[PDB]
C-alpha cells in the first residue's frame, strides 16, 4: 500500500467516518485515495481553520477522534489556531499535514515549512515522518496518544514523496483504546466520608462532567446538595432538575453567585473545572472560601494552581463519580428565577423569542461576541447537551465551525447557530460548506455593524442578502415584528443552510 | 507613559502609518491609543490571517517597517500563516500579539496561550515581555532585527496588565538604520574579471533586484548579455527591454528555456534568487551545467544549497550590482514572442483582453490558482513593479491581501488583483476591509465553481451577485462579449472595490 492510504487505513480503523480541510497537491495523496473509499467522507471547508473548529465538535459530539487535513506550509499554520482550541479542550484531534519532498526540504520548495516545531507548543505530540518504513508507527503512535490519559490534538507531517511510497510492511495495528486515568479506590472511600462527614456543600460543575451527567445528578440528589454550572457547562444540567440553581462565572446568574457567596456550605465539590477565569469570576475567592474543597479532574496539573485543594480526586470523571456515587450510598434550594422575555426590540428580547420557536432539542453552538453573554445568562436549558459555548480559547467563527462538526457528528439533533457580524466576516463562507454537505443549521446573525465586547463601527453590511446570493434562504429581521415563529419554523425546514439576521444595535450592557 | 503606548511611540518613530488587525480587549490599550495618534491608522481586517498578508505587501511597496496586531490566543495564532509568508519573503513586518496577565498565565485565563514558541520558527525574533521595565528595550531590539540585512518579521507578545503599566524609563532611542550587507570589495572586483575574461554569460534575475532594477538593467547593458527572470520576479524587467528575454522557470517561457540550456553562455550570473522549485523548473541543472557560477544574494545561506557557486558575492544588490557595474566599466538576443489573444472563451483570452484595457501602470496582485500560470505565461510587462506574484509559500488569499497592501503604501498605482473562487471563499470578505478604507481596487474573481490545480467540484456560486449584496460595483463574465472595455473601465472608476466575476469552466491546461 501506499503510505498515504495506510494512514486512512488506520484512521478508518479507529472509527473515523469524516475528514476536515483543503486539498491541494501535497495532500493529494490522500484525497485521491479517498475517491475510493465509501467509509470516509472529506469535508471541504474555505478556511482551515474553521475545519479545526469543526473537527473538534466533531470529536466533543462523537466522543472520539477528528481528523483534520491541510496543505505543506500555508494550510499547515492556518490550522494552528484549530490545534491550540482542541489542546486547551482535551479534545482528540489528528492534525495531518503535507510537506514538501524530503530530499528538497532546506531548498525553497514551493510552499516549503517544517510544520513539526509550530505544532508542538499545542499538541501532545508532533511529528514530520521522513522515512516510510516509520509511517505505521507513527500515525498508530500519534493516535494512541491523542485518545490515551488527558486527551488533546496530535500532529503528522508526511512529506508528499513519502505519501506516495509502499509501506514496507502493512500490518494495521488494532483500533487504540482509550487508557483512562483511574481514580484511587481508596481517595474516593475517603471523600465519601469527608462528604458524608462535613453535612453541607454544593457541587460547581465545569464541562468536565460532560460524559458522566446522569451519574453526576446522581450524586448530587444522594448528597441533597445544590449545583451550579460554569458558563462553558450551562448545557449540560437541565433547568428542571430541583437541585440546578443555574450558571456561577461569567455572565452567570444572581441565585449562583448568592449561593457561592454565602456561609450556608461547607465542602465545595469542584468536578471538572479548571477553575479558569470564567468559571471563578475572575479568581474570586469565594468559591473555595471558608470551605473545605474537593476536586476531582483527570489533568493532575490543574490542582492547587490557584485554589488550594484539601483533596484531589486524580481520575477520569466518567470512572470517580458514579464510584463516589456508590461509595456516599454505602455509607448512607433557591435556584434562578427563569427570565421572561418582552415586546421592546433588544438582544435579550430577541433571543428569548427564538428559543420559544424552536424544539426542546434543539443545540444552540454560540460565537464569540456580546450576545454570548445574554445566551448564557438569560435562556433556559431545556434538557441536557444543548449548549456548545467557548468561553476559553474563544476563537471567532468558533461558532460556526462548531455548527457544522455538530450536524455531521449527531445529524438528528437541531442545530442553532448564534453568531455575529464579524464572526461571519471572518468565518460566514463556512455557510458555503454547510450547503454543500446538505446541512440543515440556522445561522442566527446579530449583526450591530461593530466588532463590539471609529475602527471598531462599520458600515453594515446586508448580510441576509449576503445570504441570498449565496442561494440560501433568508430573512431579515430589523423589528420585533419580523421575528415570528412561521419565519423561524420556515427557514428551519429546509435541508441546508439559513440565515435569520438580526439587524440591532442594542447598546445595552 | 503607558507601555502600549511607548511602544506605538516606537513604531510611530520607525516610520509606520498603518497597523492591521483586528482589535479585541487584550489589544485595546493599542487601540484605544490609536484614537488619540493622527500618523497612525488601524486597518482593522476580517481575518487576522488576511491582515499579515497586507502588511507583508505593506511592507514590500513602502520598502519599510509594517505591523499587524492580534488579540491574545486566537487573534495571535491566526497570524502565525502571515508571518511564515513574510519570513521566507524577508519581509520586515512586526507581529503584535496582546497576551492574558502576567499573573494569570498557567492559570487558564480566557484566550490564554503563549505565542513566544508558536513564532519563534517563522520568525527572526519573538519574545513574550514579562516586565514592564523590559518593553522599550524589547519593542526596540525587534524592530533593529526586523530591518535586518536579511529583513525578516518578529514577534513581540505583550501581557495585557504590562500594556497599561507606566514604563519606568520613557527614553526613545533613535529611529532604526535599515542594515544592508556590506559586500567586499576585493570579491567584487574579482568577479568583475571574470565576467571580463569569460567573455559571455547570461544573467538570472530574482526578486532581490527589485530595489535596484536601473543599476541590474545597466550590469547587462554594459556586459552585453541577456536576461531571463524568474517567475516571482516577472514584473521587475519591462519586455520592451532588448536583453530581456523572459521568464525561466515555473510557467516560463519556451525562448527563456532555450536560452538556460543551450551550449551558449559561459557565465551564469546569477542576481537575488534562492534557486528554488520554482525558479529552477524543480531543480534543473540547464541554470548553471558546464558555466561559470556567480551568485549575488544578502543571505548567506543561499549559497551552494544545490547549485555549486563558483564566486559567492555576500551583499545587497543594492550596493553590489551598482558597484559592480562600476568594476566592469572600469576594466572595459531571440526573446520571447508576445502572446496574441482571441475570440475564444479561454481564460488565456479573457486576461489579455483584460490587459488591453488597463493602464500600463496597473500592478496586478496575483492569488494563488490555475490563473497564476497564464499570468506569468502570458501577460506583457508593460513597465517595472507591475505583477505581485507569490509562488513561494503560496497562501490562498495572498493576492487579495497583497492587493490592499499594494493601494495603501502606493495610492497612485492602479491595482488589479487576479484571484479565483477558492481564493475568495477564503479571505475574499476582505473585500468589506477595501470597502470600509475606500480603496479603488479591482477584483476579477476566476469562477470556475472548483477549486483546481467530487470534492473538488462544487456548486457555483454567483460571487458578482454576492458583491452586491455587499454593496460593491460587479459585473458577471460568461461569454467573451461580456468583457467589455467600457465595462472594466466603469468599475475602475469607483472610489472603493469592484468585482468583475469571470465565470469560467476552463478545461484546457495551464502553462
Ligand atoms: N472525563 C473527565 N474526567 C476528569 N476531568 C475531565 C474530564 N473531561 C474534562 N475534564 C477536566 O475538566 C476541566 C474542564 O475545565 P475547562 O475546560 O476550563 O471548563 P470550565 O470552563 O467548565 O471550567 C479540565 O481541567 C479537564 O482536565
Ligand atoms: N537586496 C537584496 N540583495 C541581495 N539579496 C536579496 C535582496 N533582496 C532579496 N534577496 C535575496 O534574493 C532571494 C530571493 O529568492 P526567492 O525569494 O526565492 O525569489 P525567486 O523566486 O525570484 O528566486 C533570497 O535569497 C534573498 O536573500
Ligand atoms: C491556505 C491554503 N490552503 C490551501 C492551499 C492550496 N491550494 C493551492 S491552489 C488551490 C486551489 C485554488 O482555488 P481557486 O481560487 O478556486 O482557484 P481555481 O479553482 O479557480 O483555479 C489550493 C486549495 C493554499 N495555497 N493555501
Ligand atoms: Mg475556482
Redesign the interface.
Known sequence: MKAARIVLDVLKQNGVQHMFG????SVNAF?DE??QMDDIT?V?T??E?AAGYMAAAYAKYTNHLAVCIACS??GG??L??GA??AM?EHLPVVFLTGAVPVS?L?????????AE??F???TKYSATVNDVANVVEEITKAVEIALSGVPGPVHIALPIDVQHQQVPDATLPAAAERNLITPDADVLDRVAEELIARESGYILAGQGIRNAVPALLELAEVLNWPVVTTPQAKGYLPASHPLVVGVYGFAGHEAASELVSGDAHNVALIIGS?????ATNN?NAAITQDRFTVQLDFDASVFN??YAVDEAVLGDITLSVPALVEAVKARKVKKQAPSEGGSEYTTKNVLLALQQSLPASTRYTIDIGEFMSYMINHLEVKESYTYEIN??????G?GIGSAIGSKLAEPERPVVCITGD?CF?????EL?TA??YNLPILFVVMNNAR?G?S??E??P??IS??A????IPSHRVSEMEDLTEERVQELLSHNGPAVLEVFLKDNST
Request: zero cysteines; charged letters at 15%.
Open positions: 483543503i486539498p491541494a497537491g484525497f479517498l475517491t472529506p471541504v474555505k478556511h481553520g506550509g500555508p499554520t492556518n494552528v489556531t491550540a482550541n486547551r528538497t532546506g531548498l525553497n520548495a514551493s510552499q516549503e515549512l517544517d516545531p509550530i508542538r507548543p499545542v479548571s477553575l479558569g477565569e470564567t479568581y494552581r490557584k468561553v476559553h480559547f474563544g476563537a471567532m468558533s464579524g466576516f471572518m468565518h460566514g463562507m458555503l450547503k454543500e466588532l465586547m475602527a471598531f462599520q458600515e453590511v446586508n442578502a449576503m441570498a446570493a449565496m442561494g
